[PDB]
Design a protein around this motif. Structure first.
Motif, PDB file in Angstrom:
ATOM      1  N   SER A   1      49.055 -33.041  51.279  1.00  0.00           N
ATOM      2  CA  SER A   1      49.555 -32.348  50.100  1.00  0.00           C
ATOM      3  C   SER A   1      50.306 -31.084  50.499  1.00  0.00           C
ATOM      4  O   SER A   1      49.817 -30.292  51.309  1.00  0.00           O
ATOM      5  CB  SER A   1      48.401 -32.001  49.162  1.00  0.00           C
ATOM      6  OG  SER A   1      47.782 -33.174  48.668  1.00  0.00           O
ATOM      7  N   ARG A   2      51.493 -30.898  49.925  1.00  0.00           N
ATOM      8  CA  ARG A   2      52.250 -29.667  50.084  1.00  0.00           C
ATOM      9  C   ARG A   2      52.742 -29.237  48.708  1.00  0.00           C
ATOM     10  O   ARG A   2      52.324 -29.780  47.684  1.00  0.00           O
ATOM     11  CB  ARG A   2      53.416 -29.826  51.065  1.00  0.00           C
ATOM     12  CG  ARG A   2      54.519 -30.745  50.594  1.00  0.00           C
ATOM     13  CD  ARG A   2      55.765 -30.564  51.430  1.00  0.00           C
ATOM     14  NE  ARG A   2      56.431 -29.305  51.115  1.00  0.00           N
ATOM     15  CZ  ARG A   2      57.557 -28.888  51.678  1.00  0.00           C
ATOM     16  NH1 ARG A   2      58.168 -29.635  52.583  1.00  0.00           N
ATOM     17  NH2 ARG A   2      58.081 -27.726  51.324  1.00  0.00           N
ATOM     18  N   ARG A   3      53.625 -28.244  48.683  1.00  0.00           N
ATOM     19  CA  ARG A   3      54.012 -27.630  47.425  1.00  0.00           C
ATOM     20  C   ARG A   3      55.425 -27.077  47.536  1.00  0.00           C
ATOM     21  O   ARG A   3      55.731 -26.344  48.481  1.00  0.00           O
ATOM     22  CB  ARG A   3      53.015 -26.527  47.074  1.00  0.00           C
ATOM     23  CG  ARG A   3      53.347 -25.700  45.864  1.00  0.00           C
ATOM     24  CD  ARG A   3      52.162 -24.824  45.547  1.00  0.00           C
ATOM     25  NE  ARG A   3      52.532 -23.429  45.366  1.00  0.00           N
ATOM     26  CZ  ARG A   3      51.702 -22.492  44.926  1.00  0.00           C
ATOM     27  NH1 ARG A   3      50.444 -22.794  44.649  1.00  0.00           N
ATOM     28  NH2 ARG A   3      52.124 -21.246  44.789  1.00  0.00           N
ATOM     29  N   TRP A   4      56.283 -27.441  46.584  1.00  0.00           N
ATOM     30  CA  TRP A   4      57.640 -26.904  46.493  1.00  0.00           C
ATOM     31  C   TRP A   4      57.632 -25.705  45.555  1.00  0.00           C
ATOM     32  O   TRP A   4      57.616 -25.857  44.332  1.00  0.00           O
ATOM     33  CB  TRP A   4      58.613 -27.973  46.010  1.00  0.00           C
ATOM     34  CG  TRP A   4      59.020 -28.945  47.062  1.00  0.00           C
ATOM     35  CD1 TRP A   4      60.161 -28.914  47.796  1.00  0.00           C
ATOM     36  CD2 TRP A   4      58.279 -30.077  47.522  1.00  0.00           C
ATOM     37  NE1 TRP A   4      60.190 -29.966  48.676  1.00  0.00           N
ATOM     38  CE2 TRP A   4      59.040 -30.694  48.527  1.00  0.00           C
ATOM     39  CE3 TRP A   4      57.048 -30.632  47.177  1.00  0.00           C
ATOM     40  CZ2 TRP A   4      58.609 -31.834  49.188  1.00  0.00           C
ATOM     41  CZ3 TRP A   4      56.625 -31.762  47.835  1.00  0.00           C
ATOM     42  CH2 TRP A   4      57.401 -32.350  48.827  1.00  0.00           C
ATOM     43  N   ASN A   5      57.657 -24.508  46.127  1.00  0.00           N
ATOM     44  CA  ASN A   5      57.715 -23.295  45.327  1.00  0.00           C
ATOM     45  C   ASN A   5      59.164 -22.958  44.992  1.00  0.00           C
ATOM     46  O   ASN A   5      60.033 -23.041  45.861  1.00  0.00           O
ATOM     47  CB  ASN A   5      57.089 -22.126  46.076  1.00  0.00           C
ATOM     48  CG  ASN A   5      55.665 -22.400  46.501  1.00  0.00           C
ATOM     49  OD1 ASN A   5      54.727 -22.231  45.723  1.00  0.00           O
ATOM     50  ND2 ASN A   5      55.492 -22.810  47.748  1.00  0.00           N
ATOM     51  N   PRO A   6      59.474 -22.582  43.757  1.00  0.00           N
ATOM     52  CA  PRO A   6      60.864 -22.274  43.421  1.00  0.00           C
ATOM     53  C   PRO A   6      61.329 -20.997  44.094  1.00  0.00           C
ATOM     54  O   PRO A   6      60.539 -20.112  44.424  1.00  0.00           O
ATOM     55  CB  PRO A   6      60.834 -22.124  41.899  1.00  0.00           C
ATOM     56  CG  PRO A   6      59.463 -21.694  41.608  1.00  0.00           C
ATOM     57  CD  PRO A   6      58.577 -22.352  42.616  1.00  0.00           C
ATOM     58  N   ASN A   7      62.639 -20.913  44.301  1.00  0.00           N
ATOM     59  CA  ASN A   7      63.236 -19.744  44.926  1.00  0.00           C
ATOM     60  C   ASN A   7      63.268 -18.589  43.941  1.00  0.00           C
ATOM     61  O   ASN A   7      64.231 -18.449  43.182  1.00  0.00           O
ATOM     62  CB  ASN A   7      64.646 -20.066  45.409  1.00  0.00           C
ATOM     63  CG  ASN A   7      65.247 -18.957  46.223  1.00  0.00           C
ATOM     64  OD1 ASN A   7      64.629 -17.917  46.426  1.00  0.00           O
ATOM     65  ND2 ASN A   7      66.466 -19.165  46.691  1.00  0.00           N
ATOM     66  N   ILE A   8      62.236 -17.752  43.943  1.00  0.00           N
ATOM     67  CA  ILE A   8      62.102 -16.669  42.979  1.00  0.00           C
ATOM     68  C   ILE A   8      62.289 -15.349  43.705  1.00  0.00           C
ATOM     69  O   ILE A   8      61.573 -15.050  44.668  1.00  0.00           O
ATOM     70  CB  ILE A   8      60.750 -16.710  42.257  1.00  0.00           C
ATOM     71  CG1 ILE A   8      60.638 -17.997  41.445  1.00  0.00           C
ATOM     72  CG2 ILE A   8      60.620 -15.509  41.348  1.00  0.00           C
ATOM     73  CD1 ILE A   8      59.266 -18.261  40.906  1.00  0.00           C
ATOM     74  N   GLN A   9      63.239 -14.553  43.227  1.00  0.00           N
ATOM     75  CA  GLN A   9      63.590 -13.276  43.822  1.00  0.00           C
ATOM     76  C   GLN A   9      63.233 -12.162  42.849  1.00  0.00           C
ATOM     77  O   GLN A   9      63.479 -12.282  41.645  1.00  0.00           O
ATOM     78  CB  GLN A   9      65.086 -13.223  44.132  1.00  0.00           C
ATOM     79  CG  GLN A   9      65.563 -14.272  45.117  1.00  0.00           C
ATOM     80  CD  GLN A   9      64.916 -14.142  46.466  1.00  0.00           C
ATOM     81  OE1 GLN A   9      64.530 -13.053  46.877  1.00  0.00           O
ATOM     82  NE2 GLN A   9      64.797 -15.256  47.172  1.00  0.00           N
TER      83      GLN A   9
ATOM     84  N   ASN B   1      60.384 -11.190  38.243  1.00  0.00           N
ATOM     85  CA  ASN B   1      60.485 -12.320  39.161  1.00  0.00           C
ATOM     86  C   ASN B   1      61.395 -13.350  38.507  1.00  0.00           C
ATOM     87  O   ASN B   1      61.050 -13.918  37.467  1.00  0.00           O
ATOM     88  CB  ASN B   1      59.114 -12.921  39.457  1.00  0.00           C
ATOM     89  CG  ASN B   1      58.205 -11.975  40.209  1.00  0.00           C
ATOM     90  OD1 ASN B   1      58.642 -11.261  41.108  1.00  0.00           O
ATOM     91  ND2 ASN B   1      56.927 -11.978  39.854  1.00  0.00           N
ATOM     92  N   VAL B   2      62.557 -13.588  39.105  1.00  0.00           N
ATOM     93  CA  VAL B   2      63.546 -14.495  38.541  1.00  0.00           C
ATOM     94  C   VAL B   2      64.009 -15.458  39.621  1.00  0.00           C
ATOM     95  O   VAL B   2      64.107 -15.100  40.799  1.00  0.00           O
ATOM     96  CB  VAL B   2      64.745 -13.732  37.942  1.00  0.00           C
ATOM     97  CG1 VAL B   2      64.350 -13.108  36.631  1.00  0.00           C
ATOM     98  CG2 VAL B   2      65.229 -12.663  38.895  1.00  0.00           C
ATOM     99  N   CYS B   3      64.278 -16.692  39.213  1.00  0.00           N
ATOM    100  CA  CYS B   3      64.760 -17.720  40.121  1.00  0.00           C
ATOM    101  C   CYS B   3      66.277 -17.641  40.238  1.00  0.00           C
ATOM    102  O   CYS B   3      66.980 -17.355  39.266  1.00  0.00           O
ATOM    103  CB  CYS B   3      64.333 -19.109  39.637  1.00  0.00           C
ATOM    104  SG  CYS B   3      65.095 -19.646  38.085  1.00  0.00           S
ATOM    105  N   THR B   4      66.780 -17.913  41.445  1.00  0.00           N
ATOM    106  CA  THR B   4      68.200 -17.721  41.708  1.00  0.00           C
ATOM    107  C   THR B   4      69.077 -18.548  40.783  1.00  0.00           C
ATOM    108  O   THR B   4      70.254 -18.218  40.606  1.00  0.00           O
ATOM    109  CB  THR B   4      68.527 -18.067  43.159  1.00  0.00           C
ATOM    110  OG1 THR B   4      68.211 -19.440  43.407  1.00  0.00           O
ATOM    111  CG2 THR B   4      67.751 -17.187  44.111  1.00  0.00           C
ATOM    112  N   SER B   5      68.544 -19.616  40.194  1.00  0.00           N
ATOM    113  CA  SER B   5      69.315 -20.365  39.212  1.00  0.00           C
ATOM    114  C   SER B   5      69.642 -19.495  38.008  1.00  0.00           C
ATOM    115  O   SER B   5      70.774 -19.496  37.512  1.00  0.00           O
ATOM    116  CB  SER B   5      68.543 -21.611  38.789  1.00  0.00           C
ATOM    117  OG  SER B   5      68.376 -22.494  39.884  1.00  0.00           O
ATOM    118  N   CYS B   6      68.658 -18.738  37.522  1.00  0.00           N
ATOM    119  CA  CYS B   6      68.911 -17.818  36.418  1.00  0.00           C
ATOM    120  C   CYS B   6      69.876 -16.717  36.833  1.00  0.00           C
ATOM    121  O   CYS B   6      70.765 -16.335  36.063  1.00  0.00           O
ATOM    122  CB  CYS B   6      67.594 -17.229  35.920  1.00  0.00           C
ATOM    123  SG  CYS B   6      66.574 -18.405  35.008  1.00  0.00           S
ATOM    124  N   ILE B   7      69.716 -16.188  38.047  1.00  0.00           N
ATOM    125  CA  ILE B   7      70.656 -15.192  38.553  1.00  0.00           C
ATOM    126  C   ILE B   7      72.067 -15.762  38.562  1.00  0.00           C
ATOM    127  O   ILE B   7      73.008 -15.150  38.047  1.00  0.00           O
ATOM    128  CB  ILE B   7      70.231 -14.721  39.955  1.00  0.00           C
ATOM    129  CG1 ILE B   7      68.840 -14.088  39.905  1.00  0.00           C
ATOM    130  CG2 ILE B   7      71.247 -13.747  40.525  1.00  0.00           C
ATOM    131  CD1 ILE B   7      68.276 -13.743  41.255  1.00  0.00           C
TER     132      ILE B   7
END
Lengths: 56, 97, 48
Positions: free
Chosen positions: A23-31, A45-51
RNA sequence: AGCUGUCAACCGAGCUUUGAUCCGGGGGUGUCCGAAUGGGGAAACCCGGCAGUCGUCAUGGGCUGUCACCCACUGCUGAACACAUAGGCAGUGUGGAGGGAACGAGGGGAAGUGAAACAUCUCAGUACCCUCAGGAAGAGAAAACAACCGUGAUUCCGGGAGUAGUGGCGAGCGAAACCGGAUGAGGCCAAACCGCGGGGUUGUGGGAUCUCU
RNA sequence: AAGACCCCCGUAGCUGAAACAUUGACGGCUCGUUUGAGAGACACCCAAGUAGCACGGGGCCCGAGAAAUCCCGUGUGAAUCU
RNA sequence: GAGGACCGAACCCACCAGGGUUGAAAACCUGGGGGAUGACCUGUGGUUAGGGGUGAAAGGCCAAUCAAACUCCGUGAU
RNA sequence: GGCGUAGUCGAUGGACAACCGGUUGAUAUUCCGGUACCCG
RNA sequence: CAGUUUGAUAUUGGUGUAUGUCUAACCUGGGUCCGUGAUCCGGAUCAGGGACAGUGUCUGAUGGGUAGUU
């Protein structure tokens, strides 16, 4: 967890050459970004998609 | 006065205590009562003064644990009780009988 | 990101020019300082 | 026309044809703990603020109401700092908190076991855990099937079928089209355009805007 | 007080509610609508960091395979009835 | 008049022997024995939790149980 | 769910005013006698 | 497999000759001030670092530290 769009982390399996699954985990790119919501300075804390979309 | 802000001192004074020690204490003008367990010495003094119109000098309170009793089925416990010993001014008396 | 200039910026263009720049450059420097704004159709009429 | 619950006899003393006991509906009381929520705490204990009120020469003491936090909104004030916000103050809310046998939706997710060993695989998306519910839940009105003929939202039951397939092609796993049944239902918005309101709702494409009949 | 249709409680069959609950019907009440249809124009709108694509995964008969459809994270990233 | 100083009761400990061994005691009794101002003993209140704690280190101790505690569940495992 | 600021709890410590004698079958620095002390 | 670690890529920009420089993203467990009675936190403001580091996805190396078994 992006505080804007609610994008959360995904879960799945890490697969080896032997095809053993673990088991692993894909954490979103949050800056962490300083933004102005309602004229007040705040840090989010915002994800680069929103940026990229200009949502902040 | 209403039906919720009504209090009568006779509620504090549950009943007198009849016993050899209490009888011995009568001769010294110390009267023993069983009182509502939630009352304090100050309430006991005010209650006695209002009920009997006597001048109370001092009040001692004894907190007595209920006696555990065996039964056919098992063990029960009598009610706990609070006893107050009221010392009256010289020349004052109460007719409890 | 392609943008409308509100002030003259060296090596980019004059005020009112519609120019394409890297998103980071505009987002962090130009837009906060009022030098430029995001492109919109309303932007075109605004220039005119 | 008797009755004063039961273990559970007994005594004593009472209520009752001026209708008791008993039964059904409504109402009043409802100490203290417990989400516990004035503060504290070793649950059922301890100590208070504010307003009112009883009492006393007066303190001491009684009694009633009220006072946690978070969230929603209305107002006052607005820091470092100047707008200004952060924050603070005031006013309200039948807002939330916790409980519950099974059933449900969405997430996380074992091993014993099987493979006559074991790691891919199985056990199994089970046990268990997390969030959220409702009387049911979920799904649900085609960016669907089918095959050139056609059916027309979803759900559930019996088939298709242990079949096509899938698998260290090992142990195992395993549909769909379509058929017969239970029930039967369709509505509304966003967008463009006009001033939160109007507007419009589409698969034979429809809507806007303009011209004409 | 031993095997009861006729001893008792009942059963068949009828009958009953001041009170409150559940649920109908009706009246008040509330709401919606009050121009519409056809023809021609025009290419203005028809859900965006989304679809698709690249990588890494999950689920489907399908164990990643030539792998379609469906879901997730990271990058890249359209069009509006031609 | 110092000391991880000396002798030695309390206190802490457990080197030897005998007894006990279905015991008075699931680890003790009797006589000797070691430390006994220190790295000491002890009370009260805290705190570290299971592939983890703690350990002047014996795999020792973690509720008479430890080369991985105990209870419920998978579970009527194999 | 982990940590933690203001705070709030937490004695095994700090602050704080009573002694002698008598008595009951059972309590006594608590009741009784004498003389004291502290807070309001 | 955790951990350590390499590179690409996103966060990530300007400008000059792989490598300089700049400030504006980002980082300061640097100073001072306010919320505020407050070594947490946040907001200011000066002082620096700086498109580096940290973090997400992808990727090579190491990996008895741990885990399942022969």
């Amino acid at each position: 967890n992006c505080d804007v769009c609610g994008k959360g982390p995904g879960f799945g399996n890490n697969i080896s050459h032997s095809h053993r699954r673990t088991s692993r985990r894909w954490n979103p790119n949050i800056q962490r970004v300083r933004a102005v919501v309602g004229r007040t300075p705040k840090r989010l804390n915002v994800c680069t998609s929103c940026i990229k979309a200009g949502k902040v | 006065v209403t039906s919720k802000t009504f209090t009568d001192p006779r509620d504090i004074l549950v009943k007198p205590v009849v016993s050899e020690k209490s009888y011995a204490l009568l001769d010294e003008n110390k009267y023993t009562f069983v009182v509502d367990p939630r009352a304090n010495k100050t309430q006991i003094k005010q209650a006695v003064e209002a009920v009997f119109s006597v001048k109370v000098t001092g009040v001692n309170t004894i907190n007595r644990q209920g006696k555990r009793k065996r039964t056919r089925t098992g063990y029960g416990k009598r009610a706990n009780t609070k006893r107050a010993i009221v010392t009256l001014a010289e020349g004052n008396r109460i007719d409890i009988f | 990101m392609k943008i409308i200039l509100t002030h003259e910026v060296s090596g980019l263009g004059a005020a009112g020019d519609v120019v394409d720049v890297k998103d980071g450059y505009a987002r962090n420097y130009l837009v906060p300082r009022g030098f430029a704004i995001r492109w919109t159709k309303g932007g075109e009429k605004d220039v005119a």
